[PDB]
Design an enzyme around this catalytic site. Structure first.
Site, PDB file in Angstrom:
ATOM      1  N   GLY A 198       0.868  -1.158   0.000  1.00  0.00           N
ATOM      2  CA  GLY A 198       0.000   0.000   0.000  1.00  0.00           C
ATOM      3  C   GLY A 198       0.909   1.213   0.000  1.00  0.00           C
ATOM      4  N   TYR A 253       9.945   2.991   1.746  1.00  0.00           N
ATOM      5  CA  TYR A 253      10.793   1.854   2.073  1.00  0.00           C
ATOM      6  C   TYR A 253      12.240   1.953   1.642  1.00  0.00           C
ATOM      7  CZ  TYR A 253       6.433  -0.508   3.234  1.00  0.00           C
ATOM      8  OH  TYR A 253       5.228  -0.862   3.793  1.00  0.00           O
ATOM      9  N   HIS A 268       9.395   4.109   6.848  1.00  0.00           N
ATOM     10  CA  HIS A 268       9.164   2.733   7.275  1.00  0.00           C
ATOM     11  C   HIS A 268      10.465   1.998   7.485  1.00  0.00           C
ATOM     12  CE1 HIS A 268       4.983   3.074   7.128  1.00  0.00           C
ATOM     13  NE2 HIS A 268       4.764   2.771   5.862  1.00  0.00           N
TER      14      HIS A 268
HETATM   15  C1  LIG Z   1      -4.102  -6.284   7.568  1.00  0.00           C
HETATM   16  C2  LIG Z   1      -3.386  -5.507   6.481  1.00  0.00           C
HETATM   17  C3  LIG Z   1      -2.067  -5.086   6.689  1.00  0.00           C
HETATM   18  C4  LIG Z   1      -1.347  -4.348   5.685  1.00  0.00           C
HETATM   19  N1  LIG Z   1      -0.035  -3.981   5.975  1.00  0.00           N
HETATM   20  C5  LIG Z   1       0.673  -3.276   5.017  1.00  0.00           C
HETATM   21  C6  LIG Z   1       2.085  -2.897   5.254  1.00  0.00           C
HETATM   22  O1  LIG Z   1       2.696  -3.172   6.274  1.00  0.00           O
HETATM   23  N2  LIG Z   1       2.737  -2.176   4.241  1.00  0.00           N
HETATM   24  C7  LIG Z   1       2.074  -1.819   3.020  1.00  0.00           C
HETATM   25  O2  LIG Z   1       2.726  -1.194   2.228  1.00  0.00           O
HETATM   26  N3  LIG Z   1       0.806  -2.189   2.771  1.00  0.00           N
HETATM   27  C8  LIG Z   1       0.071  -2.901   3.702  1.00  0.00           C
HETATM   28  N4  LIG Z   1      -1.224  -3.274   3.432  1.00  0.00           N
HETATM   29  C9  LIG Z   1      -1.850  -2.914   2.122  1.00  0.00           C
HETATM   30  C10 LIG Z   1      -1.835  -4.081   1.083  1.00  0.00           C
HETATM   31  O3  LIG Z   1      -0.483  -4.468   0.836  1.00  0.00           O
HETATM   32  C11 LIG Z   1      -2.527  -3.572  -0.199  1.00  0.00           C
HETATM   33  O4  LIG Z   1      -3.873  -3.196   0.122  1.00  0.00           O
HETATM   34  C12 LIG Z   1      -2.565  -4.667  -1.282  1.00  0.00           C
HETATM   35  O5  LIG Z   1      -1.245  -5.066  -1.634  1.00  0.00           O
HETATM   36  C13 LIG Z   1      -3.292  -4.111  -2.475  1.00  0.00           C
HETATM   37  O6  LIG Z   1      -3.392  -5.177  -3.635  1.00  0.00           O
HETATM   38  P1  LIG Z   1      -4.515  -6.232  -3.694  1.00  0.00           P
HETATM   39  O7  LIG Z   1      -4.271  -7.064  -4.958  1.00  0.00           O
HETATM   40  O8  LIG Z   1      -4.624  -6.932  -2.502  1.00  0.00           O
HETATM   41  O9  LIG Z   1      -5.826  -5.619  -3.799  1.00  0.00           O
HETATM   42  P2  LIG Z   1      -6.550  -4.250  -4.328  1.00  0.00           P
HETATM   43  O10 LIG Z   1      -6.448  -3.130  -3.321  1.00  0.00           O
HETATM   44  O11 LIG Z   1      -7.773  -4.523  -4.830  1.00  0.00           O
HETATM   45  O12 LIG Z   1      -5.811  -3.576  -5.451  1.00  0.00           O
HETATM   46  C14 LIG Z   1      -5.558  -4.141  -6.753  1.00  0.00           C
HETATM   47  C15 LIG Z   1      -5.895  -2.953  -7.747  1.00  0.00           C
HETATM   48  O13 LIG Z   1      -5.726  -3.459  -9.147  1.00  0.00           O
HETATM   49  C16 LIG Z   1      -7.047  -3.430  -9.803  1.00  0.00           C
HETATM   50  N5  LIG Z   1      -7.095  -4.668 -10.539  1.00  0.00           N
HETATM   51  C17 LIG Z   1      -7.695  -5.851 -10.155  1.00  0.00           C
HETATM   52  N6  LIG Z   1      -7.578  -6.806 -11.068  1.00  0.00           N
HETATM   53  C18 LIG Z   1      -6.869  -6.219 -12.096  1.00  0.00           C
HETATM   54  C19 LIG Z   1      -6.410  -6.728 -13.406  1.00  0.00           C
HETATM   55  N7  LIG Z   1      -6.642  -7.955 -13.834  1.00  0.00           N
HETATM   56  N8  LIG Z   1      -5.700  -5.805 -14.179  1.00  0.00           N
HETATM   57  C20 LIG Z   1      -5.442  -4.518 -13.766  1.00  0.00           C
HETATM   58  N9  LIG Z   1      -5.828  -3.974 -12.594  1.00  0.00           N
HETATM   59  C21 LIG Z   1      -6.541  -4.863 -11.792  1.00  0.00           C
HETATM   60  C22 LIG Z   1      -8.077  -3.286  -8.730  1.00  0.00           C
HETATM   61  O14 LIG Z   1      -9.256  -2.715  -9.195  1.00  0.00           O
HETATM   62  C23 LIG Z   1      -7.349  -2.413  -7.686  1.00  0.00           C
HETATM   63  O15 LIG Z   1      -7.464  -1.038  -7.864  1.00  0.00           O
HETATM   64  C24 LIG Z   1      -2.022  -4.033   4.421  1.00  0.00           C
HETATM   65  C25 LIG Z   1      -3.376  -4.465   4.201  1.00  0.00           C
HETATM   66  C26 LIG Z   1      -4.072  -5.197   5.205  1.00  0.00           C
HETATM   67  C27 LIG Z   1      -5.500  -5.634   4.923  1.00  0.00           C
HETATM   68  C1  LIG Z   2      -4.840   0.137   1.827  1.00  0.00           C
HETATM   69  O1  LIG Z   2      -3.507   0.563   2.144  1.00  0.00           O
HETATM   70  C2  LIG Z   2      -2.910   0.230   3.393  1.00  0.00           C
HETATM   71  C3  LIG Z   2      -3.521  -0.514   4.411  1.00  0.00           C
HETATM   72  C4  LIG Z   2      -2.769  -0.799   5.689  1.00  0.00           C
HETATM   73  O2  LIG Z   2      -3.345  -1.458   6.550  1.00  0.00           O
HETATM   74  C5  LIG Z   2      -1.470  -0.327   5.870  1.00  0.00           C
HETATM   75  C6  LIG Z   2      -0.823   0.444   4.834  1.00  0.00           C
HETATM   76  C7  LIG Z   2       0.424   0.711   5.409  1.00  0.00           C
HETATM   77  C8  LIG Z   2       1.486   1.509   4.713  1.00  0.00           C
HETATM   78  O3  LIG Z   2       1.244   2.761   4.064  1.00  0.00           O
HETATM   79  C9  LIG Z   2       0.597   4.016   3.732  1.00  0.00           C
HETATM   80  C10 LIG Z   2       1.169   5.074   4.561  1.00  0.00           C
HETATM   81  C11 LIG Z   2       0.704   6.435   4.428  1.00  0.00           C
HETATM   82  C12 LIG Z   2      -0.336   6.765   3.473  1.00  0.00           C
HETATM   83  C13 LIG Z   2      -0.912   5.730   2.650  1.00  0.00           C
HETATM   84  C14 LIG Z   2      -0.449   4.374   2.778  1.00  0.00           C
HETATM   85  C15 LIG Z   2       0.625   0.210   6.630  1.00  0.00           C
HETATM   86  C16 LIG Z   2       1.836   0.279   7.570  1.00  0.00           C
HETATM   87  N1  LIG Z   2      -0.573  -0.462   6.955  1.00  0.00           N
HETATM   88  C17 LIG Z   2      -0.752  -1.165   8.255  1.00  0.00           C
HETATM   89  C18 LIG Z   2      -1.475   0.734   3.629  1.00  0.00           C
HETATM   90  O4  LIG Z   2      -0.946   1.374   2.746  1.00  0.00           O
END
Ligand SMILES: Cc1cc2nc3c(=O)[nH]c(=O)nc-3n(C[C@H](O)[C@H](O)[C@H](O)COP(=O)(O)OP(=O)(O)OC[C@H]3O[C@@H](n4cnc5c(N)ncnc54)[C@H](O)[C@@H]3O)c2cc1C
Ligand SMILES: COC1=CC(=O)c2c(c(COc3ccccc3)c(C)n2C)C1=O
Ligand SMILES: Cc1cc2nc3c(=O)[nH]c(=O)nc-3n(C[C@H](O)[C@H](O)[C@H](O)COP(=O)(O)OP(=O)(O)OC[C@H]3O[C@@H](n4cnc5c(N)ncnc54)[C@H](O)[C@@H]3O)c2cc1C
Ligand SMILES: COC1=CC(=O)c2c(c(COc3ccccc3)c(C)n2C)C1=O
EC number: 1.6.5.2
Lengths: 273, 273
Positions: free
Chosen positions: A149, A155, A161
């Site tokens: 995200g 990073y 981070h």
């Molecule tokens: C509990 C939790 C902890 C997290 N901790 C962190 C963290 O420590 N650090 C961090 O950086 N992030 C963190 N995140 C965020 C997470 O890494 C992102 O939300 C995730 O990687 C986004 O990708 P996704 O595929 O899961 O889903 P999505 O958010 O759905 O995103 C995929 C995107 O691509 C689009 N898409 C789907 N299919 C296709 C296709 N075939 N072609 C083109 N586009 C497409 C979708 O519409 C969407 O906009 C956390 C999330 C959760 C729930």
């Molecule tokens: C759905 O995205 C995210 C969901 C999270 O749960 C999350 C993110 C991040 C990292 O990053 C950021 C930081 C600032 C602004 C926007 C995203 C952390 C640590 N966590 C736990 C996401 O991005």
């Protein structure tokens, strides 16, 4: 080279980019004649909690249950849970294993963490003897295609981070390389929720083209087990002549073996011995 | 000070040192007047798998489920699965939060990982506008009591496993501190399976003895967020003035913020920076 590859996906939505990322790899690898098989954890209604429910047979010591010893015993006599055996059969067969997943709390999703804990049983995945270099999966290569995200800058070495090379370490070194895996360069997809539809379709394509020559890829550098005295006695520390021979180097050997010095740039993200 | 403590025990057997180590804490703490609440994940039969079922109400976008958004919304609007909420109610009450667990695959058990992934929900546990030292739990202090299979030599700077400080980073910094907690020194008890009976007893008494003055302790060192550009256009990187001021300094700030330089010893294990 390889011909059979296992893709472990850990995401709950068939509508996510991760799923997309998985289908991309599946299509690509199949193109070049690979033989794909997948482990969509959520799809298998997979159980990530290690427990005695993992041993079907008779426990050696129910009074004091020691999971490591019981599960390793299970792997020999044949008392392991039916879902674990099947996954162990996917690995054993597989040459390449892609771990597709979203970064969650600076690590892998709980469900995939448990998949390791329950499938990577002693004897099978690792031997306290033949660790790292000499591990069981040494003839296999593994890759992490992650999505985050937070953006890449967050990073970097000046990012709030911290260094992503530090985050990937425990995973790529501690779990993957420990069992003998040659870990390829991680496919890092930062801020996928802030990517234009156009840029995203290119990531799918960027990922597939890579897969056409993924096997001849130059892997990540890990300090060879030959630089350490491999015995409880010696506490498994670097050979003395290495501790000294290394003292004249500007950088450490890797993120984990930084040896109090400068960490080699992108030791976990970029290949180059 | 702190009259409230929460103890998170991620271990299936109440015959383990981890279970005992948890009893030790509870005993010590209560005697000094603390109110001690617990979260025996294995006892509670905790659900560690993040799913859309973590949201009680009706989603905002049911055909495109984003765990992050739907879960935050449900938090704010009041409809998070009641089990996740019970846990959050436990966290808000606690001054001190102890995490008792064996080191598994260079990290936290899948059961505790999923605990973090479901209870540490947006807005509640972390805010992108109040990262790290400005987090919601800044008036709380966290501690990790970890038992290990491998000896502490295996985790020194020259051990095969690599420095423990790199293994601790993701957790203490990525999860705990990112939420605001003041992370206290981890209670590391190595190779518990190769430790004399008498020794095992002193380990339990040292824990207890340390808990008598845990609050007064100075926490581990993490680079303040005042050093960073907490704004999107800047990418969340370290401020220029600060960046320059550092280029002439031998050591880095921390593990993740080593800055290509040398990481102060035991940045994650010891405090004094
Ligand atoms: C509990 C939790 C902890 C997290 N901790 C962190 C963290 O420590 N650090 C961090 O950086 N992030 C963190 N995140 C965020 C997470 O890494 C992102 O939300 C995730 O990687 C986004 O990708 P996704 O595929 O899961 O889903 P999505 O958010 O759905 O995103 C995929 C995107 O691509 C689009 N898409 C789907 N299919 C296709 C296709 N075939 N072609 C083109 N586009 C497409 C979708 O519409 C969407 O906009 C956390 C999330 C959760 C729930
Ligand atoms: C759905 O995205 C995210 C969901 C999270 O749960 C999350 C993110 C991040 C990292 O990053 C950021 C930081 C600032 C602004 C926007 C995203 C952390 C640590 N966590 C736990 C996401 O991005
Ligand atoms: C899937 C998996 C992955 C693992 N990955 C790693 C890893 O990456 N790195 C690593 O280093 N280790 C790893 N381990 C090993 C793990 O860290 C150890 O098995 C664990 O820390 C041992 O402690 P315990 O408290 O759980 O239980 P136990 O093994 O039971 O040991 C406690 C010991 O103290 C004794 N004892 C119990 N209660 C008391 C009491 N009240 N007073 C005095 N003595 C007592 C017991 O008889 C026993 O000898 C892994 C284990 C598993 C199952
Ligand atoms: C029950 O103990 C252990 C069980 C494990 O499942 C395990 C250990 C270690 C680490 O350590 C050692 C310790 C001594 C010699 C060789 C390896 C790892 C990575 N795993 C996955 C143990 O110690």
């Amino acid at each position: 080279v390889g011909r059979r590859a296992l893709i472990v996906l850990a995401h709950s939505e068939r509508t996510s980019f991760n799923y997309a990322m998985k289908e991309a790899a599946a299509a690509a690898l199949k193109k070049k004649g690979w033989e794909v098989v997948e482990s969509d954890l959520y799809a298998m209604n997979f159980n990530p909690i290690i427990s005695r429910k993992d041993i079907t047979g008779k426990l050696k010591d129910p009074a004091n249950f020691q999971y490591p010893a019981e599960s390793v015993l299970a792997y020999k006599e044949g008392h392991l849970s039916p879902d674990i055996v099947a996954e162990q059969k996917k690995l054993e067969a597989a040459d390449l294993v892609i771990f597709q997943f979203p970064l969650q709390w600076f690590g892998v999703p709980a469900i995939l963490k448990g998949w390791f804990e329950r499938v990577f049983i002693g004897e099978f995945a690792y031997t306290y003897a033949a660790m790292y270099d000499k591990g069981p999966f040494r003839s296999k290569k593994a890759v992490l295609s992650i999505t985050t995200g937070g953006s890449g800058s967050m990073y970097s070495l000046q990012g709030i981070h911290g260094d992503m090379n530090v985050i990937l370490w425990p995973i790529q070194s501690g779990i993957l390389h420990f069992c003998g895996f040659q870990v390829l360069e991680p496919q890092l997809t930062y801020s996928i929720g802030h990517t234009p539809a156009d840029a995203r379709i290119q990531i799918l394509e960027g990922w597939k083209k890579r897969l056409e020559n993924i096997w001849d890829e130059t892997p990540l550098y890990f300090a060879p087990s030959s630089l350490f005295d491999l015995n409880f006695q010696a506490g498994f520390l670097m050979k003395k002549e290495v501790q000294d021979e290394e003292k004249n180097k500007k950088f450490g050997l890797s993120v984990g073996h930084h040896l109090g010095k400068s960490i080699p740039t992108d030791n976990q993200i970029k290949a180059r011995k």
